[PDB]
Symmetry: D2
């Protein structure tokens, strides 16, 4: 079809619901078109915002009853993802996300007009005067992105991490009776149990996940209502308040208007902190991932104290740790995303930080990739972790760390000799102690109890 405005006539695909402005933008912004389409999470959140906005304005007498109801309906459709294919703009547009705001306004306006029995392009429901009433791209984009990130955390990241925590916790309980060598500086230290080792991974995830959930609270403070620079000019005094209330009712999260609307436009420090906590979580996943591949290294020239499930339905102990590699590659990508967000966050100027799209994009990318990788790592590796009892035992029984009990039982002299023999002849302390006649294969087991070292209290 052909839409007409004071700027001229533009041709838009007859099946598309965006308007002339979006069509022009689609033809002008060509940076990263293939991989950087504006995240749909932002679009869905924008739908929620526009829906709450129509309701607020209607209630405050800023919009005609019928037109408002049509907008509310059209907006809800966007939220339900019925118009995802009508948003073709990239992340690399204006630093205020103006193009996407107008894309949202045009699609919802045209659909609203259609609902009201008007052909697309009529603007019966005006994109700017109605759908964008009392709003600016300046305050609505950051509002939409804060909501998008908060929802993405609950929808994808938390379920994935909480799932892996449950898996590790289950494995930790199941293997808590298996005593093994503990290592510090990568060197043989003292005994621990495989359950204690795996439990530490679960603990790191609980600790880092808790921090993400705490930082998440900063996202509850929205810029909505401050309009262009934070003064709220052109918006009803209660517009922001109501929009926040409705967003909170729809999401179940305690959203509210930021105590200071100026800072909510000039910076996005709350988002920076959320990304930072996600980065720390990623760091813990790298630590855990590496522990896993090192413990599974082998079959014979590594550590090999645990085995991981085959990558494709190669015997146990010879499986390449593919899930660790995919996970850690995601982790290094996440650290880079954090760098991008924090760097951008320090670059605001006066009344508006103009790096909003990329800050939102890199944070969402991190959330989605981590959610994908954690879920994959969990289902395809973590859940199938098993101990290699033979390897664990061989290391423990032949290690000097078990000589402790001997020193008090038969004196250091004899114990030291037993250890020296075992190491020299590559035998277990029990075997050496037997070939020396210092202790029977019976007395040894009564004096040397590995679990007493791993659980000394």
């Amino acid at each position: 079809r052909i839409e007409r405005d004071t700027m001229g006539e533009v041709r838009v695909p007859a099946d598309k619901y965006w308007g002339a402005q979006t069509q022009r933008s689609l033809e002008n912004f060509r940076i990263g078109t293939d991989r950087f389409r504006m995240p749909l999470e932002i679009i869905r959140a924008y739908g929620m915002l526009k829906k709450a906005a129509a309701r607020a304005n209607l209630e405050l007498g800023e919009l005609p009853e019928e037109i408002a109801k049509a907008i509310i309906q059209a907006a809800e459709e966007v939220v339900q993802g019925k118009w995802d294919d009508h948003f073709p703009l990239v992340v690399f547009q204006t630093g205020s996300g103006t193009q996407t705001n107008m894309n949202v306004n045009e699609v919802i306006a045209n659909r609203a007009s259609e609902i009201l029995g008007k052909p697309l392009g009529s603007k019966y429901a005006h994109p700017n005067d109605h759908v964008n009433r009392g709003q600016s791209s300046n305050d609505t984009f950051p509002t939409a992105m804060y909501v998008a990130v908060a929802l993405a955390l609950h929808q994808r990241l938390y379920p994935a991490v909480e799932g892996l925590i449950r898996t590790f916790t289950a494995k930790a309980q199941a293997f808590d009776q298996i005593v093994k060598v503990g290592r510090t500086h990568l060197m043989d230290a003292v005994p621990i149990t495989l359950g204690q080792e795996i439990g530490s991974w679960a603990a790191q995830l609980k600790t880092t996940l808790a921090a993400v959930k705490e930082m998440e609270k900063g996202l509850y403070n929205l810029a909505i209502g401050g309009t262009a620079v934070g003064t709220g000019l052109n918006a009803h005094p209660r517009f922001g308040e109501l929009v926040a209330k409705y967003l909170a009712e729809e999401t179940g999260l305690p959203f509210r208007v930021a105590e200071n609307r100026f800072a909510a436009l000039a910076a996005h420090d709350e988002l920076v902190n959320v990304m930072g906590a996600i980065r720390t979580l990623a760091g813990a996943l790298m630590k855990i991932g590496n522990d896993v591949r090192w413990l599974a290294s082998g079959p014979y020239a590594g550590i090999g104290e645990i085995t991981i499930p085959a990558n494709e339905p190669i015997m146990p102990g010879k499986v390449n740790p593919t899930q660790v590699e995919a996970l850690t590659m995601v982790v290094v990508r996440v650290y880079g995303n954090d760098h991008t967000v924090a760097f951008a966050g320090s670059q605001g100027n006066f009344q508006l930080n103009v790096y909003k799209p990329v800050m939102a994009y890199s944070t969402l990318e991190s959330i989605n990739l981590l959610a994908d990788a954690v879920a994959s790592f969990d289902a395809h590796l973590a859940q199938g972790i098993e101990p290699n009892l033979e390897r664990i035992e061989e290391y423990l029984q032949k290690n000097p760390m078990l000589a402790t009990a001997l020193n008090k039982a038969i004196g250091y002299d004899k114990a030291a000799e037993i250890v020296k023999k075992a190491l020299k002849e590559k035998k277990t302390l029990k075997q050496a102690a037997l070939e020396l006649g210092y202790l029977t294969e019976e007395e040894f087991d009564r004096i040397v109890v590995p679990m007493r070292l791993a659980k000394p209290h």
Copy 2:
């Protein structure tokens, strides 16, 4: 003096109280000796830890009264900074901080022996058997570093940032009636007040400082009691618990043993997040600092809406020109801090098995950030922020050209008769153009054009 360890005997300065393992580290790790001596915050915190440890072991029957009391006295002297010159080791030593732990054990043990009328190097009060009783460097170093960082936040960073928040809050109130041009994309936007702008800076600091204080809570969870790998082997069953209790009594902070002792040794994710929050605060300071120098730019060919105190001559002299030197020092600290964060988070991802062996550098870079920011924020506050003043004339010059002030005319005398006043008081003041044309009087003008109404529409 001759000192010894399991490896043998070595010579140490007769006037120093450290021992053999300190001497070996001194000689074997000549890395960053000039600028990277282990932070005294860590040494003082270690003194607090060793005092609590002796107190706990005595209470639990693990140490004799005589020796324990001497150790407690010696440790307290360390906390008071009386032995600072007896810690000569660098940050770049063993990754577990073993050498500094032994430096602490040796100094306290020697001073304790002396307090008991025993000679130095005698080890009557033994560094390992007594001062380090039930401990490992693995759990004590991170315990001491978490305490050190938590205390430094309260002692230096918070007071500085809270001070700047107070200054900006006061300035915002004082200039809240000064209407000016807002800017978006760096372009002229709708009116705002200077008070709202400065107030936004204060808000950013409140928001970021709040996050640092929330992340600080993770430091309350200590590794103490986990000994070598987290099992607590060699420690009395109640040792860790009592030490954390005593540290809480000593500091006023709610220190407790971490729920999972193993993760407390294998990683320091809590410290990583504290540093991360500090990085965000630094980012806010850069944004604020840049706003300040841009607003004060010029003073003739820049924006120049505010003026700042002139504290030094400067390189190139020009009457009225004041380089924003305090902003430059602050932003240089900010870029340093982002690097510190990079270092801490990188190290945090590199733990292996039961121990992360990057502890010293993680603690050092976090403390450096705290100290530099505390220094720079306080300096910026005292030497610039407190002296910020508006340039009323320049502010008004810009405002009068703002199209928003002309919107009240379009619907008061017509769009043409209003746009015409724009082609007159432009290509000075609109209040004059309307007068020269008779379209409106100066009395009615100020009645139709009320900039504050635009800055505060609600």
Copy 3:
């Protein structure tokens, strides 16, 4: 169709040329499927590698004549991009890029078999025994990625940056007679010309671009020939040498086998340095971009010494600097990409760094986004930069920096008084000097010559 191997039977789209292994991989690797498809630059380069490999093996007597010629033909087709749609794997696979290597082997094998009159799936031309002869994913993936990045630099980044340099150089020459205020610490300093100011931007780009081109040379050292761990086991002693020679002949770049093949597999330090130089180039683009929006800030409350072309075919001086915003958002993304690559580069273990896919991806992303952004910034802003003579003049003529000549002509006392009057009455130094009778509007122009300050020698 249905392919059959020792692992079982698999169903592959009748129109797709990949095999059972790729089909299984497509179904197993689900991390970042939407935005992280393996870069086609890597696929095209792999085609070049496989083509050179077939030729080398044929010449060395490692492959049957006919089968080799069919492979060479199939490979060339991949290079020409005729099979781009037959590579559906993501970047987040094994850290060795094994899945993509096999994807390349299967597609080329099936096409080769078809050319030889054999239905797809027959393996007449064997993916592993023929197409992958004397090769490993370990040495071929990094070889393909080094070639991909080097070509991407010449094909996209260099043309874009060289173009902007030409633009700035042209503008610098054209505006070299326009004297203006120079600024240090953001404060009024001494006079310069708009041409000198714009010329500095061109210089930064020349300097940073030169560094990228120097680091590029490190990519000429390929891992090809080292096979699994660098020993060259299972490959002809001259296989690597010949493959490198053929790659060099086809690209026009002096590719060769790395002096040390072990290091070429265990690390990719050369790629890290290339990304680092790209990061520095990005930093210069941010500096330049910011200078541009600050100089164009206005219309009346900023600097406004230059104007930028409208974003859509808003009067001069009121145009939002959209191209700067898009460019700087790309810059912060690039800094993050560099972080990812350098971090990954330090994580190699023993004989193989297993972060290859992500290191390659983040570097290529940076190259493509910068190429896109620089070209856009150039065509839509840089080329249309114009001076705002009125603003420039008003700042210069009313600035104390022009009083220098006065001091020597009429003494500091009078000159200082002239400046004090001009600033007090907001008038030009010439006007003030006239209202004081110290100098005529004629004598002033003979004593105060701005260009003599901007070009003192």
Copy 4:
């Protein structure tokens, strides 16, 4: 002593040679006073610069013979480190380094006046009129910092890295006949030699050091002569040219004035790239260091293919166990260096108009990286690398289980009769299993199974 500047008079220590602007900076920028005093490398380089400047101005008739000669003598004393204690300013001062430039001008001018029998504070040899003649802090600070960094690379970093390359090269040759198991994905792979593995470390250092030396060339382009903004206003037309010439004579490096003087003041992209290359070198050192500690891990329940020197007792004692402490110090320096790079590159993107005002921190973080790496590489080399020895028994234990050694049997006595020897000498040595089964003799075995053939197939 009373000293003065355009702002007024101030009191300075009677035993110090600095002036008023140094004193003001001393008092107004108390940021990082303990660890961030301006690098002496920059001070020494500034001495070289001021010496060349006086020499150039004298040659060009811009300075009197008497005063010029005194300044040259005074400047040379600074280069020799005779006045190090007279530079008390920190890195976190003005972003242009103006305060340090004046600190240099004041010390040299006072010493010059004294050399001419004049009293301190008299300014017979004036800090601004003579020592700073034809210069600005804007062009001299980056000139001094580029020279400082270039010299530090040659004086400290290159010798250290070249030394380690030599050590690894020697070790690789000595162990090139020791066949071992290669590892990919951390899993057992095909055979290689210990010499090839260690050789790869040497290669990584050669590759990264080469890039640092290439980036170093960008530092040869100096800002000198551009004065305040790049125009050269106030400088003699040949001043910059001669100064660069004299600096080249003095240092042996090909210093020249940058083609574009403006970009030399508005940015320091060359320094950013040098730091970037240093970061890559650090990454290689981490990879190498990690390989070293993993190979030495154990020594009983780890990989343990190599052993390293034991330099200290350590925390937990176990016969034969040696913590890889030198690797820990080195990798902690590496994570610090990545942070330094982040800082330098961040600052590099923040220049505005005619001047980047993050100069001090950019120079400082680069020099810190150079010095810490030089320290750590040298330490790691002397205290660990030079003592690396193979654990022949462990290496052989792993190799014998490698499937590749069994491939020569499958086609020598059958796949079944070969796979059977794998179910015997596994669930010790394959050379024994073949004997106990009579399938092959020990003489024929070593004739069929030649591991080196696998490690060196070409």
